[PDB]
Design a protein around this ligand. Structure first.
Ligand SMILES: *[C@@H]1O[C@H](CO)[C@@H](O)[C@H](O)[C@H]1NC(C)=O
Ligand SMILES: *[C@@H]1O[C@H](CO)[C@@H](O)[C@H](O)[C@H]1NC(C)=O
Lengths: 49, 49
């Protein structure tokens, strides 16, 4: 309660930084991309055979 | 094609280029309320207009 304004400001600033890091570039979503790739590699070998 | 099927042909009389597409095929699913409940079903033809 005695420091509520500081906590609110740095909460808002942290959300802004997360938004910027998702905006500019993101390999952080590699795990969802990695799931996508091994499926498409699985079918490309099935058509190849 | 990549799986060694012919997809385009040239007409040996009029020299017109023709594309070849498969005839429709898919799966069939049967939706039932249960034999003890009723003898009716509904049919789902998968992946077709
Ligand atoms: C082949 O014959 C058809 C009719 O018999 C004709 O329309 C066509 O132009 C002919 N093609 C050639 C290459 O002579
Ligand atoms: C299915 O085909 C009919 C007749 O060709 C067409 O009117 C309809 O829009 C089609 N629906 C699709 C492509 O989802």
């Amino acid at each position: 309660y005695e420091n509520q304004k500081q906590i609110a400001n740095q909460f808002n600033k942290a959300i802004s930084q997360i938004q910027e890091s998702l905006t500019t570039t993101s390999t952080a979503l590699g795990k969802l991309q990695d799931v996508v790739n091994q499926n498409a590699q699985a079918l490309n070998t099935l058509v190849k055979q | 094609d990549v799986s060694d099927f012919t997809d385009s042909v040239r007409d040996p009389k009029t020299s017109e280029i023709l594309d070849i597409s498969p005839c429709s095929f898919g799966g069939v699913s049967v939706i039932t309320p249960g034999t003890n409940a009723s003898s009716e079903v509904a049919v789902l033809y998968q992946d077709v207009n």
